[PDB]
Scaffold this active site. Structure first.
Site, PDB file in Angstrom:
ATOM      1  N   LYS A 297      -2.131  -2.562   6.913  1.00 16.76           N
ATOM      2  CA  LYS A 297      -2.821  -4.383   7.116  1.00 16.76           C
ATOM      3  C   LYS A 297      -2.178  -5.379   7.369  1.00 16.76           C
ATOM      4  O   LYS A 297      -1.872  -5.962   8.501  1.00 16.76           O
TER       5      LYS A 297
ATOM      6  N   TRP B 168     -13.959  -0.540  -4.296  1.00 16.91           N
ATOM      7  CA  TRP B 168     -13.888  -0.118  -3.265  1.00 16.91           C
ATOM      8  C   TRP B 168     -14.268   1.220  -3.175  1.00 16.91           C
ATOM      9  O   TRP B 168     -13.858   2.119  -4.181  1.00 16.91           O
ATOM     10  CB  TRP B 168     -12.004   0.026  -2.555  1.00 16.91           C
ATOM     11  CG  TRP B 168     -11.745   0.292  -1.258  1.00 16.91           C
ATOM     12  CD1 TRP B 168     -12.587  -0.021   0.212  1.00 16.91           C
ATOM     13  CD2 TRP B 168     -11.686   1.654  -0.906  1.00 16.91           C
ATOM     14  NE1 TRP B 168     -11.982   0.961   1.018  1.00 16.91           N
ATOM     15  CE2 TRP B 168     -11.163   1.902   0.831  1.00 16.91           C
ATOM     16  CE3 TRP B 168     -10.515   2.919  -1.521  1.00 16.91           C
ATOM     17  CZ2 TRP B 168     -10.452   2.667   1.211  1.00 16.91           C
ATOM     18  CZ3 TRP B 168      -9.689   3.125  -0.835  1.00 16.91           C
ATOM     19  CH2 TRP B 168      -9.503   3.750   0.660  1.00 16.91           C
TER      20      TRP B 168
ATOM     21  N   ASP C 194      -3.278  -0.806  -6.812  1.00 19.70           N
ATOM     22  CA  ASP C 194      -3.579  -0.374  -6.137  1.00 19.70           C
ATOM     23  C   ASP C 194      -3.323  -1.896  -4.816  1.00 19.70           C
ATOM     24  O   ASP C 194      -4.203  -2.943  -5.180  1.00 19.70           O
ATOM     25  CB  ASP C 194      -5.022  -0.139  -5.475  1.00 19.70           C
ATOM     26  CG  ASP C 194      -6.142  -0.344  -3.765  1.00 19.70           C
ATOM     27  OD1 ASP C 194      -5.051  -0.719  -2.560  1.00 19.70           O
ATOM     28  OD2 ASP C 194      -6.683   1.023  -4.122  1.00 19.70           O
TER      29      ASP C 194
END
Lengths: 396, 396
Positions: B246, B130, B211
Site C-alpha cells: 500500500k 482481517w 502486522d
C-alpha cells in the site's frame, strides 16, 4: 520462545557457493551452479525479456492485485505449452492453472492442496532427485519415498528397477516425474517408456505429478512435452508444477504455474477452488512482473519468435559443451567412455566422479561440482574446457 | 482422487467485486475495495516507482536467484523503517529480515516458522480483524482466538475489554497487533495504550506478532511505528510481518518482509536459519522486481524524497475525504454523530451501518461496502461524495 531452537542443517550447496567466492585462485571453475550461463560465464537477462519489460514500463498503469490464480493470458499460454494447441484437455476445459512464485511455489501449492483436500499421504520421487522436493512435500506433512532410476554402469535409465521399485506404491499415492531434463542425471524416459509408465500408473491408481522446469532444453518445446502429453492422454487427473525460471532466464522474478487436471470441467473447477484457498492462505496472489513478461512474450508473434530463438541458442550451446567435454576428456587422456554425456539432456549430468574425487577437484584444482558428482555443463566454456578436463583426468 | 472434493466457501469479498462489475447502473460507487484510489478513482503506479523501474531496466544485467532472505539492502532499509535509525536492536544485530511475497507471505512464513520450531499453538487476533489472518494461521495448524477490541457506542478502542479478553491468553501464545491503521476499524492504541500493552505482554509471556501493512498512512512513517518500537523496547523477542503493497502502491509485485527479533545475535541467527528453511520449502526465494524497486527508492535520496511526498499526498487525501464525508453527511441530514470518522486512521472505517443497510445500499443505490459495514474512504471523491451520502442518509 526462541532460545532452544536448533539451527537448520547447513545447506551443502550454498556452503559450496561461499567457498567458491572466497577461493582466490585464478583458474577456478564453478560447475556446481544450478542456472544457465552463456559463453562469457554470465546469466544474462534475455533480449526478449528486456523488450517485454520496456513495453510493461511504458504501458502499465496500475499494480493492483492480480486474482489468486494470476494473469489469465499467462494461464492460457501455459496450458498451450503443456498440452499443445487443440488439446482435448483444453477444449474440454479440464485444466485450471494458477500462476505461482516459481515452480517451487507450484510444488508447495500442489502439496498443500493434496494434503488438505485428498487422502494423499505419500509422494514417490526418483533416486536421485532434486533435494528440495523432499523439504517441500514434508513441509505439507507428506512422506517422500524413493524409486530406483539410475543405471550407473551404462549411465542410463534402469527401467526394470524403476518399475519394480514402484510396485511398492499404493493406489492413491502420488508419483513425481520430471517432464524432461531430469535433474540431476539428464536421463529421460523415451516416448515408449513414457507411454508404458502412463499405462502402468493408470492401472495402479497413481496420481501423476509432473515437475517441468526445463521445457525446451532437451530437444525443443513440443518434443519435451511428449511424455506429459502421453500421461494426459491416459489419465483423468494429474498435476503439473512448471517453471519459467530457466527457459525465460527469469529465476529471481518467481514465475511458475500449478496446473490441475480433472475428469471434467465441473470437477476441476470445484477442486481448483480449494487450490485457490491454499494459495490465499499462503502468499495470497502471485507476483505480476515475471509472469506479465512471459504472457507479453508468448502472446506476441515477434517477441515469441525472438525468445524461441534465444531458447534454441541456449539448448544448442549446452549440446556443444557436452560434445566438447567428451572430446577434450578423450584428448587429455581420460581413457574412460564418457559418451553418455552426449546423450543426456539439459544442463546437468552425473559425471560419475565420487564424492572424494569431487572434494579433491575442489581442494587441489579449484574446480567445483556438487558431492553427488553432478556437473552443470553450462558452466563449461571453450576457454575453461582444457583446464577443467586436465584436472578431471588428474583425479580419475 | 478429486471427485469428492468440496468447493471452497465462496469468498464474500470477491463475490461483491463481481456484482459491482456486472452492475450496469451509472452512478455506482465501490467503497468495498481494499486498495488506495486517487481522486480520479484510479490506483496508479507511483512516480517514484516508475523512475525506479526505468533505472532497473537500464541497469539489471541478470535475473539470477536472490538469496532465500532476498535483497540485503531491502532488509536493512526495512529494519530502519521498523525500528528507527540508531535503534539498539539494529546496533546489537538482534533482528533478521527475510524479504517475502507480500505481508501475507510474511505472515505465512512466520506461522510455518512458529508451528515447526516452537511450542506455539495459538494466535490471538482482534475482533474484528482481517479475515485472511485466520486462514493463514490455521493453514499452519495454529488455532486462532479473538480478543475484544471495538467499542461500538463511542466508536473507539474498548481498552478494558481488550485487557480482560487477553487474560485468557496463556504464556507462549502469540498475540497479533496491527502496527497502525487497524483493518477494518481505523482505531489504533494511543502511545500510552501501546506502552501499557507492551508491559502486560512481557509480564504474561505473550509473543508479539505485528502486522504492519500501512506504515505512513495514519500520521507518518516514524509516528506510525511508535507502537512497535514501544514493544521492541520491552521484549527480547517479537516478529513483524510488514508490507509495501500500500505505501509503495506495489500490491501485485508481492513485496513484504518477515522480521524476526531475539535476545541476541547468536539466538536470532540460529532461529532465522529455521525461518529460511521454512521459506526454502515454500517458494524457495522471493520475487526480485518489487523489492528491488523499494530498495532502489529507499536507498537514493532523490527517489526517497519523491516517494515520501507521494505517501504524504495519499495520507492527506484520505484525511480530506474523512472530513468531507462527515461534513456532507451532516449537510444531507444524517443527524447522527459521525465525528469518529475524522479520528480514525488509514483507508478503512466501520461506518456503523448494519449488514442489511449495506445490502440495501447495494441493491437500491448501487453503493457497495462490505457486510461488516467497513468502507474504504479512499473510494470517495469530491465528485461522488454527495450521491454517496444521499444514499447513506436514505437507509439510516
Amino acid at each position: 520462545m526462541f532460545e532452544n531452537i536448533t539451527a537448520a542443517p547447513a545447506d551443502p550447496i550454498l556452503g559450496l557457493a561461499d567457498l567458491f567466492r572466497a577461493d582466490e585462485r585464478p583458474g577456478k571453475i564453478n560447475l556446481g551452479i544450478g542456472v544457465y550461463k552463456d559463453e562469457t560465464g554470465k546469466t544474462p537477462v534475455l533480449t526478449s525479456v528486456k523488450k517485454a519489460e520496456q513495453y510493461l514500463l511504458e504501458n502499465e498503469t496500475t499494480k493492483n492485485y492480480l486474482g489468486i490464480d494470476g494473469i489469465p493470458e499467462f494461464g492460457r499460454c501455459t496450458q498451450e505449452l503443456l498440452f499443445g494447441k487443440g488439446s482435448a484437455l483444453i477444449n474440454d476445459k479440464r485444466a485450471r492453472t494458477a500462476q505461482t512464485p516459481g515452480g517451487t511455489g507450484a510444488l508447495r501449492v500442489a502439496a498443500d492442496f493434496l494434503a488438505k483436500n485428498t487422502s494423499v499421504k505419500r509422494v514417490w520421487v526418483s533416486n536421485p532427485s532434486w533435494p528440495n522436493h523432499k523439504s517441500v512435500f514434508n513441509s505439507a506433512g507428506l512422506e517422500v519415498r524413493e524409486y530406483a532410476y539410475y543405471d550407473a554402469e551404462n549411465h542410463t535409465l534402469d527401467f526394470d528397477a524403476l518399475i519394480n521399485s514402484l510396485n511398492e506404491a499404493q493406489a492413491g499415492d502420488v508419483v513425481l516425474f520430471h517432464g524432461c531434463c531430469h535433474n540431476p542425471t539428464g536421463i529421460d524416459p523415451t516416448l515408449e517408456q513414457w507411454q508404458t509408465l502412463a499405462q502402468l500408473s493408470v492401472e495402479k491408481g497413481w496420481l501423476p505429478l509432473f515437475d517441468f522446469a526445463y521445457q525446451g532444453f532437451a530437444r525443443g518445446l513440443e518434443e519435451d512435452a511428449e511424455g506429459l502429453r502421453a500421461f494426459a492422454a491416459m489419465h483423468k487427473e494429474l498435476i503439473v508444477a512448471s517453471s519459467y525460471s530457466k527457459n525465460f532466464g527469469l529465476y529471481n522474478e518467481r514465475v511458475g504455474a500449478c496446473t490441475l487436471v480433472a475428469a471434467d470441467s465441473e470437477t476441476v473447477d470445484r477442486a481448483f477452488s480449494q487450490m485457490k484457498a491454499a494459495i490465499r492462505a499462503n502468499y495470497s496472489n502471485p507476483p505480476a512482473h515475471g509472469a506479465s513478461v512471459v504472457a507479453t512474450i508468448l502472446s506476441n508473434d515477434a517477441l515469441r519468435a525472438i525468445w524461441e530463438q534465444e531458447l534454441t541458442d541456449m539448448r544448442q550451446r549446452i549440446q556443444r559443451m557436452r560434445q566438447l567435454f567428451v572430446n577434450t576428456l578423450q584428448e587429455k587422456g581420460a581413457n574412460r567412455d564418457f559418451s553418455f554425456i552426449i546423450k543426456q539432456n539439459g544442463m546437468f549430468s552425473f559425471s560419475g566422479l565420487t564424492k572424494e574425487q569431487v572434494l579433491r577437484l575442489r581442494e587441489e584444482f579449484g574446480v567445483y561440482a556438487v558431492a553427488s558428482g553432478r556437473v552443470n555443463v553450462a558452466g563449461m566454456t571453450p576457454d575453461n574446457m582444457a583446464p577443467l578436463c586436465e584436472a578431471i583426468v588428474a583425479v580419475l
